[PDB]
Design a protein around this ligand. Sequence first.
Ligand SMILES: O[C@H](COCc1ccccc1F)CN1CCCC1
Length: 330
Amino acid sequence: STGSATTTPIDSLDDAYITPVQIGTPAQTLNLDFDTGSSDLWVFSSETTASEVDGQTIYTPSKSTTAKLLSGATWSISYGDGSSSSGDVYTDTVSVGGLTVTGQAVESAKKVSSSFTEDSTIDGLLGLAFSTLNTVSPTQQKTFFDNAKASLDSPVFTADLGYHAPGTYNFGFIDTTAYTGSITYTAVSTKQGFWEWTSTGYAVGSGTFKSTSIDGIADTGTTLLYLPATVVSAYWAQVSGAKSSSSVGGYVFPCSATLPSFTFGVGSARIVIPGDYIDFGPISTGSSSCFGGIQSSAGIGINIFGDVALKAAFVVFNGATTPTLGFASK
Ligand SMILES: O[C@H](COCc1ccccc1F)CN1CCCC1
């Protein structure tokens, strides 16, 4: 089997991407944030504290003939950015772009933190990291991909995120028309539950490539590119007026600037992020100070290849017995 679904930026800055997902019988379609940095499929639901729902579409398991309460199971998750959610668990039929999994754990939110409430466009998350990170207790549950894997033509999914445009998540096949050149594959460590890999270096604009190992994760659920302070300082030093602002919470730059590209290495291959991808617009409405798309990971504990990086590539998440990651230009 295979599946193919269009993913759409939630706003004009590509702050996140949503993908329609069918849950239950008859289908209830919710728009979920596909997140390769976590491993829970959770949704706003009929059980969510009413005051914490503001515009989201909810899953109502009582209206699904295939929904079953997973007795005694609960979940609670705290993300790297400080947001959180928790609740109970159902199993139900879940379909993405024509690919159907029966008995998928669908985690129903009873509580969500303010940042989720405040984002009316995101009805939940669909985690695509390794199932070892799943928070369901006392019996850990499998991700959608993990459940689908055996049935897929090939045990892979691909992320093809657009810049200010729709893109595609495919399951079970590689669309050879979706990228240019070849796909370069690189090793993955699953020890921390993430799609963790090692970049071979970087360049800033037309500058010389610096060969240096940078360990990090491929995370579709993170908006920006978080890299070591040395790397980030070298990038922003090329932008007149750019500076790190403690008050704003990162590097900012004049909105009048044209930004240089940023290149990262994948083996002997190179992925180039155009400068425009690195512009996240005014820090506040009407400001001429703009927020940078490349930020320091110093406060995080891990480097994160988020959407800023991933949208410059066609990315293969290879879930074979020995997982790997593939990157191609597009
Ligand atoms: O947790 C990710 C972002 O992680 C990186 C990060 C960004 C900013 C501050 C601290 C951090 F760790 C956001 N995702 C959004 C949906 C689930 C998590």
